[PDB]
């Protein structure tokens, strides 16, 4: 019954608040809609009549998140995984600490941060002594060896 970027109150076609800004009070026949900015850690990404700004995403260090792009009054924080942490989904929503590779297995491919340590059976003639996310299968040196001992 009205235009885009407007809403209908009391048969009055009121303006919505622009992105960046939240509704403080509705228009009247004599007053425009009253909008104020969102605080530093909040945002509002649409033409709105929302009274509480969305909180920016917290990039929690305790879930392997760190800030990538910082929030604005119009846009959310974007997070990403810290070094040492990879995405649990191809839609990186939370981060798992890079897995390591137990003895008798070596390292095919080191963790990306959008992918986990890829891990390979140490073939006959090769061993891994310990568990790390880095060290690979090594040969037995010349003086028995096992998948895990020289």
């Amino acid at each position, epitope marked *: 019954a009205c235009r885009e970027k407007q*809403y209908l109150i*009391n048969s009055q076609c009121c303006s919505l608040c622009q992105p960046g800004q939240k509704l403080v009070s509705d228009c009247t026949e004599f007053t425009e809609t009253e909008c104020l900015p969102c605080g530093e850690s909040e945002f509002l*990404d*649409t033409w709105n009549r929302e*009274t*509480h700004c969305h909180q920016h995403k917290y990039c929690d260090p305790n879930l392997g998140l760190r800030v990538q792009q910082k929030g604005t009054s119009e846009t959310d924080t974007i997070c990403t995984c810290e070094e040492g942490w990879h995405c649990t989904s191809e839609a990186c929503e939370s981060c798992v600490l890079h897995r390591s590779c137990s003895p008798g297995f070596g390292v095919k491919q080191i963790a990306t941060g959008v992918s986990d340590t890829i891990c390979e059976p140490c073939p006959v003639g090769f061993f891994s002594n310990v568990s790390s996310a880095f060290e690979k299968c090594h040969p037995w040196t010349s003086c028995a060896g096992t998948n895990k001992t020289d």
Partner: antibody, heavy 120, light 107 residues
């Protein structure tokens, strides 16, 4: 645009309640898309549990402080609720909904509702 | 929390009769009132938003009015499929609903 609640209809005292709301006929990614949880003890009134913007930002009834987690999964087009340490008091029909113009409402559409009974 | 008190809480009425339900807010809530209709075993169904805007699809016999502290939902000719509980809710602050108003049909 429809919403379906899914979860268990029976749950023990002290267990945690886990419900999921599946959105069809529209994407939760659109600007302005919120989700909300309302509930209704049998033959009693309505209480808002909380709302969530697709961002993940969220508000909830102060009367469930430290018990409510509400989450959104853009990828699967679902949003969720966890209510910890449940009691007979939380037996109810739980509804997911679309807060339309802000966190606080109004609510349209709703889902069918899924009854949750808290019982040994 | 903003309390909403609906009057009455229950009523019998005849087909064709006019029924008004009121919703008093404990504080001013501007125009941010909505009304829902709930049929048994079904979810609330939006009738009215922003106090007086009637939801697309809903019959015109249903109308909304009021501002600040006092609101009314009016049914100008009760049909039998109107048996239901009616609820107002406010979204000026964190959401609260009234107790509901049960509507029976006298026949």
């Amino acid at each position: 645009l429809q919403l379906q609640e899914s979860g268990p209809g029976l749950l023990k005292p002290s267990e945690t309640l886990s419900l999921t709301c599946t959105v069809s006929g529209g994407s939760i990614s659109s600007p302005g898309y919120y989700g909300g949880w309302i509930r209704q003890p049998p033959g009693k009134g309505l209480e808002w549990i909380g709302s969530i913007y697709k961002s993940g930002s969220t508000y909830h009834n102060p009367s469930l402080k430290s018990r409510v987690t509400i989450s959104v999964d853009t990828s699967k087009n679902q949003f969720s609720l966890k209510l910890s340490s449940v009691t007979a008091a939380d037996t109810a029909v739980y509804y997911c909904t679309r807060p339309v113009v802000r966190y606080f409402g109004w609510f349209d559409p709703w889902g069918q509702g899924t009854l949750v009974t808290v019982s040994s | 929390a903003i309390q909403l008190t609906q009057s009455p809480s229950s009523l019998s009425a005849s087909v064709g009769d006019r029924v008004t339900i009121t919703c008093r807010a404990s504080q001013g809530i501007s125009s941010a009132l909505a009304w829902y209709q709930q049929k048994p075993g079904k979810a609330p169904k939006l009738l009215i938003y922003d106090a007086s805007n009637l939801e697309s699809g809903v019959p015109s016999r249903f109308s909304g009015s009021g501002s600040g502290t006092d609101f009314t939902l009016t049914i100008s000719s009760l049909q039998p499929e109107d048996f239901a509980t009616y609820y107002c809710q406010q979204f000026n602050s964190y959401p609260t609903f009234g107790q509901g108003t049960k509507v029976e049909i006298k026949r």
